[PDB]
Amino acid sequence: EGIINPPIDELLEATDSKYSLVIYAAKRARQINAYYSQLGEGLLEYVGPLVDTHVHEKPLSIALREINAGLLTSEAI
Amino acid sequence: ASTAPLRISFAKIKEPLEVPNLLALQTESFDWLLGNDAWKARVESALESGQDVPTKSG
Amino acid sequence: LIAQRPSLTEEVVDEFRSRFVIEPLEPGFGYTLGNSLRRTLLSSIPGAAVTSIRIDGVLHEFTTVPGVKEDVTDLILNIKQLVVSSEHDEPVVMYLRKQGPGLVTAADIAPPAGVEVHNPDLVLATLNGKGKLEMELTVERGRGYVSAVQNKQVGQEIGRIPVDSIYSPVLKVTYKVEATRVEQRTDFDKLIVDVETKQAMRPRDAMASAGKTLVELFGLARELNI
Amino acid sequence: MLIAQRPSLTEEVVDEFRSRFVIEPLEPGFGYTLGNSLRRTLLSSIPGAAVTSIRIDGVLHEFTTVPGVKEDVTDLILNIKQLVVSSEHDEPVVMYLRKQGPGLVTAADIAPPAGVEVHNPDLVLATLNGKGKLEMELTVERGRGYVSAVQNKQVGQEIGRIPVDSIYSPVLKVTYKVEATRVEQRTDFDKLIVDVETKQAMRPRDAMASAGKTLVELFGLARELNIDAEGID
Amino acid sequence: HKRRLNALGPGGLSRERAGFEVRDVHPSHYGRMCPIETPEGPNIGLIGSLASYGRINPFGFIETPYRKVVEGQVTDDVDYLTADEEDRFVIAQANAALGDDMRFAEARVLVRRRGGEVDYVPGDDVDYMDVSPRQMVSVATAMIPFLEHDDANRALMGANMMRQAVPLIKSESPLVGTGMEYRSAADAGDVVKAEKAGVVQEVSADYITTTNDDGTYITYRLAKFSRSNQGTSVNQKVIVAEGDRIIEGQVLADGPATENGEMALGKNLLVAFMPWEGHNYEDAIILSQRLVQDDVLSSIHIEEHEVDARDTKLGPEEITRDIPNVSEEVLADLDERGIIRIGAEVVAGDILVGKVTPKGETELTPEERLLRAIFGEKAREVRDTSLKVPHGEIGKVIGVRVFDREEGDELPPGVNQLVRVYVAQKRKITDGDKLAGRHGNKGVISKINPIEDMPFLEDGTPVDIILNPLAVPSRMNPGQVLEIHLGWLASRGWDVSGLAEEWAQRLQVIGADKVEPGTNVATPVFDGAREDELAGLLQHTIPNRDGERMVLPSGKARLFDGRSGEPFPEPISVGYMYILKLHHLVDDKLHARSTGPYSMITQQPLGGKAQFGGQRFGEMEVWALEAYGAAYALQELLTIKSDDVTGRVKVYEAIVKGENIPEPGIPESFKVLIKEMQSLCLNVEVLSSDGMS
Amino acid sequence: VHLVGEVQKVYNSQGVSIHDKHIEIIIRQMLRRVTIIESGDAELLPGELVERTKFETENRRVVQEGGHPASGRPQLMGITKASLATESWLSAASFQETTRVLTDAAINAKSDSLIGLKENVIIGKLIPAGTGLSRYRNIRVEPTEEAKAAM
Amino acid sequence: VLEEVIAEHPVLLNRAPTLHRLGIQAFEPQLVEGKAIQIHPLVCTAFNADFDGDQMAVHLPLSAEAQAEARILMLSSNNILKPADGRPVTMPTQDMVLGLFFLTTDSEGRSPKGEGRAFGSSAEAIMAFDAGDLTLQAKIDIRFPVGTIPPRGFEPPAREEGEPEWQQGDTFTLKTTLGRALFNELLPEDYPFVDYEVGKKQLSEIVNDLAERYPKVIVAATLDNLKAAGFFWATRSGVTVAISDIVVPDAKKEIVKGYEGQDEKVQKQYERGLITKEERTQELIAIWTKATNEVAEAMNDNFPKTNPVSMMVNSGARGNMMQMRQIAGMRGLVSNAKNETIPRPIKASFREGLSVLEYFISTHGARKGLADTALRTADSGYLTRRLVDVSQDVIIREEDCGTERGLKLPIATRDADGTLRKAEDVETSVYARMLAEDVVIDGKVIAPANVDLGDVLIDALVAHGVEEVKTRSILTCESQVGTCAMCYGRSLATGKLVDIGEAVGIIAAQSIGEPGTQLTMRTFHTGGVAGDDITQGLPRVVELFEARTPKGVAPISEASGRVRIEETEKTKKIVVTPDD
Ligand SMILES: [Mg+2]
Ligand SMILES: [Zn+2]
């Protein structure tokens, strides 16, 4: 019910940095919001919400909940 | 006398001189510039009282 | 260890100011009951007061009536002090009319059936020889305080100006505790509640309404359990 | 004139004695009246029973040591005052407790007289070493609220009897807080939250029901003065 | 304003050219210029106010009176001394004691001499004494009671905020204050004074007609609900009766912020110096709903804004009724000529006067053309540029003024019709309003409590305002505590008679011994009531009920609680402090932007409250965002949300459609920079890694 | 040590506490310029403002060529002079003397690398501090195989 | 739908001066009525915000990246520690500290009821306090349930046990008041029972320890609880300011009488011409300074602990001893124009009220102070901007250097006979740094390399007997690009190692420029001679950072040798002859 509900130090220990965390969560939220804007086009490279979703919230909440759950990873190009 | 409303005073000492007109700094100066009846009345009152006063209007 | 049922004793010191005594209350227990009474009597008590007026020859509250020594907004201020009672659920329109030199008072108002002024000595305005004052006061039944911005419903009536109303007829409520003369280490306390209301109704009825409100809320709290 | 929304009490339970009660949105200014009145009638109006005085054999009032028990008399007093009993005699009745030899003594070892029942036979009262020699006759008296140590010429009759604090109320602590809620576009409606802590003998919801009943009876004094009208339901 | 002295302007010292030496108070300012009141901004001490007794030479230097002293027997003669004769003489004080005659009661007197040295001299050695201890202070500073207990900084702030307080609906004179408050409003020209002595014939809220002694008839017209330059109302109440006597100079009608010819800026409020659940933390104010429902702190605010009709190149715009492409309900409150009715309630975005632009450029798209074919559009092509109420403004239309070129009224060239509409609102007190005392204490309002929540006294009287007591030791203005104590004494009067004490005898000989409850008290700015007098009067207040006075001799009273009910642990100071309502209001300070007007020379959003601007994101803001390391937030605050013409519209479209925010472009101000540098013959070219751009 | 101690003894006299690394950053940025002399074999002007790393690179490349290196003395210079004498002329142009440095850049025909923060605030690009670094913006995100297998 | 939208969408709040990094803090918005922004009191001191019409702008992060940086980097529950010195800044002092002081102080001067009686738990104590037979601060034996961690000083003096037992997780009895039990109910259960006067400084230490040893959400919750309880108890704390609470010393009358008697004796001594005016003025200001110090000491000896002014100035809440000195005692000496001293001081207190001319000479100092602070904040802004330009474009860009060089910062200094004492300014110099290499005294490492230096490690080193340490600071940091994180030391705004990319230069420039308005220094007196006194305050700082030659030049000998003077009449001269 607020910004502080995801515990921040859990995210830090899950990604070992802070700016990488914020660009990581921002990119994930942009991908989620673009998934919601697909209008049923069914694009394969855009992934929907992994965690259970309320009817109306910002996609950044889904991004933080997904990464706090720790079921998603990445690599540097 | 009855000009002002009742206000209980805590003043211990008396005031031999009352506060002068608060608008003298504007009205007196502009009457000096105009040379109206008030200014000539003031200059003749000061002359008969001996006080220094400009005799030439603005 | 002793159980004594509390009993409320009512005594009067004036017409609309009377003191109430609750003797056998528990230690450290009379202050909070006095507070609950004071907050219920001072906020949520039904009443009635003028909520909208209309003066002929006046389109807004910022102008002045030709023939009265003070402006319309001072009349708005004087109307707010006028306490009335109305049993009608629907709004009731009084009438105020006065002509010629004189001093219009609250007694000069013309209330319909079921509506009466309780402070008829209140000064409203002062009329000179050329004073015209026709005024249709609306009274509504309610509780608490509602501002003038919550009393606007019609716009075509240009001459209608809504005022703010003060419904609660209670002036001030005061409580105090003492020591009971009975000898125990518990040291029960009698609670003297001083109630002084306006001329709208007696303080006994005011505490009747407040006690009804509190007993209904506490019974609502009690009933859902067991 | 009429209340916009009728409130309703709600109970959330987290433990067998810990309980928190949330009241649905009240009219403005009715949060704090209900909160403080309910807390004060909750801590100080529910009837109950607790120990009043204790008598230890072969001790003195000024001599703080008890033989055969490793802790001082203050620790024993503090353990007695944390014990819960329920009485129905409406009179001071004595309760017996004895143990001989070393070991551990609890409330289960207390022999309960008829009309007085112990509810937590698991808490420790004292420890024994060497010869036991443990004999106390602790008074159980019904009461209401919380009264500190009281002297009524009892040391003169027997010097082994010492007064003890009594937790008469079946509730331990009541910490209420009021927060604001928004209903039909209006934020100034008080949502009263009452958190009650009770001893394990009495469930907290029964204690709240008794508090509400006492408040209904007490404020019925103001209701009976006149038959008036107020907007409900 | 009419008593200020300015050092800026042509032929004077500018703010940039000023230094420490000119701003300092000189020892020759005593009686010639006020050392307290001055603007506290960048021009501190450059602008000062004339002293109360200060006169002007025929030459032009600032004079000041003094009482002549001969052989230690001071006479009833006065000489006005410049800043020059004040050096060759030695000046006594008006606080020096005197005996039964005019001789000095004590030989040793504290004096000042050339250079402002304060060294004393005993015996008959002085030759000039002050006429009043209020000689150093101005008219604004001398209003404050117990100034001698306040710090000079907080005195400066208090004298600088009393020029910002608004007048209220009905104003009451301060219960405690300097007795010169009558002279500070009688000498104001806004209060109606009798030109000739006579008797009153008729009274009305619009005019006072007085028949004078010689037989002439004069009617004093009274301004009612007119607009001042700052927007506050200047209504004038009537205080004289129907047939009472009037002498020359008598106040007939009160001005704004005046009661009974006495000057009245704010209200008396019951003060409780105690922290209250943190809603008065850090110099904030808590106050009752009793000041909302009793209409205590509220004021009339008349706002003026006009529009005019002009004959431009395409044609003349007209004021009219037929506003295009709008519902009939919007134009329900208009007249035939296109004027809103007097007394019509208005809101944000509503129509006041209907002016239609004669022609705009017509380039109709085929979509709009077919839509017009579907619905049918009015044949005259007009644009809706009529006058509408700005955002966040409510009021009643109280007066309309229409000027016409075709009539005999004069108009500026080009225009044909000019209309003025006054809208007035009765702004009540609310969150965020700025209140203040007289002693420099100030603060916004954080919570308007209900009446029952306030800590009430022993008789059920709730306090009207709750203050943090943390303010007075650090801010160093303990004079307001004296003020609240004397306010409490002036509410419930005192009966001192035959007490046979020093302060009792002083009050008996002065006249402050038999005082009815509610009468206003007067402490002169440096002759005020002493601590012993306040304590003794606290010991002998008249009873109210039960024959028991409420405030203990310590100055505090046992204050209950509203929310809890249990008494607060120890007595809390109570009293009645004059509380002002500043013009730094909250109903106009609120301002917000989503997308509004833009500047022309550069594509940044413009600024200003009346122009729907955006708050400036300065340099230190960018430093802070660099310090956080938040590159993206700073970059978008600098490019997306301003000065990117291809970015703002795309971002608004992306938000409304719901898709993600597009990538930012290049701010237009940098392109302006490049075009500026390229015109100073500087070959400024941007080249990427591959090549040029 | 002297500079740090002096500024810290000024600050400690009032009660305000500033950590000494905050001063040490400015002092390190303060002593960076080196004044050179007798530069007859290092083929640059002697007795001007020379950057330390550039001077060391010049010394390395002249001892690689066999020529004897030029001497140099560290130069404690003020914050203003060190701010004007910077590689990126956009940052110096945003400072006080904005006519002298513009003419200086025009005469010297110098083009500024965009490493810096004032020259990236002006253009509107992302600043190279914090999230704006290359090592942070170059991340690619994808859900795990069991994550998409769950839904 | 607005209330449905604005949740989970942070906004940036911002004050116009924005002196340092914490001037922009991302909050979560919340719909309220009125026309004013409602702001947590716990953070308003980090804004320098005061509720006196201060207006704060609200900026809205817009894209996903902007509000993500608002949520993670910018949130007000992540900015506990000010980067200037690492001290906590989001625990204000005006009202909550006074409440906690009253809640936790000792019963001195206030009648302790129910003093010295055992209580079964804090619930029974609360019931007794509500009854009225036990005051809030009273030494009582109160037993605590299982799981409560005992105080730091109580673990070894555990209750004596015949069998082996541990008081670490077990119940225990403590000799503490009710109020300290409530205060430890505010702090989390894992925190040790704090058993002392809280005040302000110990509250700052408590908040610092909480931030250093608990996650951010727990710290935010504990400071919110501290705020709520501090306000709750400050309402009932018994603070108020009537004029009886401010008390003048009764000895001030006779002290001033004696000093004016001897002043009169001096004045008749001066009237004969035996002494000059200047010498008389010098000795008079000396003796009047002695008088004001003596009456200040009398004032400190006068007031009790019960009156609220002392209760709000001795608790670190709001105020200093100078202000109470010149409200209760005499105002002391006050300056003239152009920085000199009047021989006659202000002998009247503000409670007693000044006279006319005494108030005039007070205005002399007041207006000069106002103009001084205006020019001071202008020059502070100028210095801040210059520092930002010179110190920017340095950013942590490497994880670690390969270097091992460092700085020989002292750790133990001014040791007495038979004992070793650490440096007084260790908290600002050696703290929050990193060791260049391991330290050994007996062949064993005490502190490993590449770790931060906190309280416990520095205490261990000074107990083992080290005099100086080698800290890896930024001056010795050499790298291919920029500076590294390890060579810079741990960041003072996060409490951890500085992340790669943090713009340390702008933070340093703001931290130097933040207290520029806070210096408030000016040369009181030149002593009648110009040039003998060096620049003080902000002009000294800007003269130091501008590398300019100071107005008082102190030459330094180039080499050791023989130095003699040459007193030429026209101009003095010194000559040093180095040896070798
Ligand atoms: Mg401020
Ligand atoms: Zn390094």
PDB file of N, CA and C in Angstrom, chain E residues 2 146 180 257 295 309 352 355 379 425 573 582 598 614 661 689-690:
ATOM      1  N   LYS E   2       3.503  56.621   3.850  1.00  0.00           N
ATOM      2  CA  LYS E   2       3.626  58.072   3.794  1.00  0.00           C
ATOM      3  C   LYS E   2       4.660  58.622   4.765  1.00  0.00           C
ATOM      4  N   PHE E 146       4.850  46.204  25.321  1.00  0.00           N
ATOM      5  CA  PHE E 146       5.999  45.480  25.870  1.00  0.00           C
ATOM      6  C   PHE E 146       7.096  45.306  24.823  1.00  0.00           C
ATOM      7  N   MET E 180      -1.443  55.123  21.836  1.00  0.00           N
ATOM      8  CA  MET E 180      -1.321  55.963  20.653  1.00  0.00           C
ATOM      9  C   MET E 180      -2.019  55.333  19.449  1.00  0.00           C
ATOM     10  N   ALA E 257     -10.284  48.211   9.316  1.00  0.00           N
ATOM     11  CA  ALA E 257      -9.449  47.780  10.438  1.00  0.00           C
ATOM     12  C   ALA E 257      -9.480  48.773  11.599  1.00  0.00           C
ATOM     13  N   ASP E 295     -17.177  33.406  12.557  1.00  0.00           N
ATOM     14  CA  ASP E 295     -16.718  34.405  11.590  1.00  0.00           C
ATOM     15  C   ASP E 295     -15.732  35.376  12.237  1.00  0.00           C
ATOM     16  N   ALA E 309     -12.871  45.815 -25.782  1.00  0.00           N
ATOM     17  CA  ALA E 309     -13.181  45.485 -27.167  1.00  0.00           C
ATOM     18  C   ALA E 309     -12.539  46.510 -28.090  1.00  0.00           C
ATOM     19  N   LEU E 352     -17.937  35.599 -17.717  1.00  0.00           N
ATOM     20  CA  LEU E 352     -18.351  36.861 -17.117  1.00  0.00           C
ATOM     21  C   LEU E 352     -18.883  37.834 -18.158  1.00  0.00           C
ATOM     22  N   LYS E 355     -17.207  38.235 -25.174  1.00  0.00           N
ATOM     23  CA  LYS E 355     -16.578  38.933 -26.286  1.00  0.00           C
ATOM     24  C   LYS E 355     -16.154  37.912 -27.331  1.00  0.00           C
ATOM     25  N   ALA E 379     -22.618  30.832 -39.452  1.00  0.00           N
ATOM     26  CA  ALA E 379     -21.944  31.397 -40.648  1.00  0.00           C
ATOM     27  C   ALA E 379     -20.901  32.483 -40.338  1.00  0.00           C
ATOM     28  N   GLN E 425     -15.113  37.573  -2.725  1.00  0.00           N
ATOM     29  CA  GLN E 425     -15.279  36.357  -1.949  1.00  0.00           C
ATOM     30  C   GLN E 425     -14.967  36.650  -0.493  1.00  0.00           C
ATOM     31  N   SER E 573       0.304  27.949  30.490  1.00  0.00           N
ATOM     32  CA  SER E 573       0.083  29.417  30.425  1.00  0.00           C
ATOM     33  C   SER E 573      -1.103  29.759  29.533  1.00  0.00           C
ATOM     34  N   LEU E 582      -2.160  37.689   8.141  1.00  0.00           N
ATOM     35  CA  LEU E 582      -1.295  38.269   7.128  1.00  0.00           C
ATOM     36  C   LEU E 582      -1.921  38.150   5.744  1.00  0.00           C
ATOM     37  N   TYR E 598       3.697  29.167 -23.106  1.00  0.00           N
ATOM     38  CA  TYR E 598       5.126  28.996 -23.313  1.00  0.00           C
ATOM     39  C   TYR E 598       5.746  30.319 -23.737  1.00  0.00           C
ATOM     40  N   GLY E 614       5.308  27.623 -14.739  1.00  0.00           N
ATOM     41  CA  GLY E 614       5.951  26.495 -14.095  1.00  0.00           C
ATOM     42  C   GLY E 614       7.038  26.964 -13.150  1.00  0.00           C
ATOM     43  N   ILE E 661       6.793   6.548 -22.271  1.00  0.00           N
ATOM     44  CA  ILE E 661       7.322   7.877 -22.598  1.00  0.00           C
ATOM     45  C   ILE E 661       8.394   7.742 -23.676  1.00  0.00           C
ATOM     46  N   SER E 689      30.557  10.849 -34.084  1.00  0.00           N
ATOM     47  CA  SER E 689      31.713   9.981 -34.284  1.00  0.00           C
ATOM     48  C   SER E 689      31.992   9.755 -35.766  1.00  0.00           C
ATOM     49  N   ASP E 690      30.944   9.522 -36.560  1.00  0.00           N
ATOM     50  CA  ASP E 690      31.139   9.282 -37.986  1.00  0.00           C
ATOM     51  C   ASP E 690      31.509  10.564 -38.723  1.00  0.00           C
TER      52      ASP E 690
END
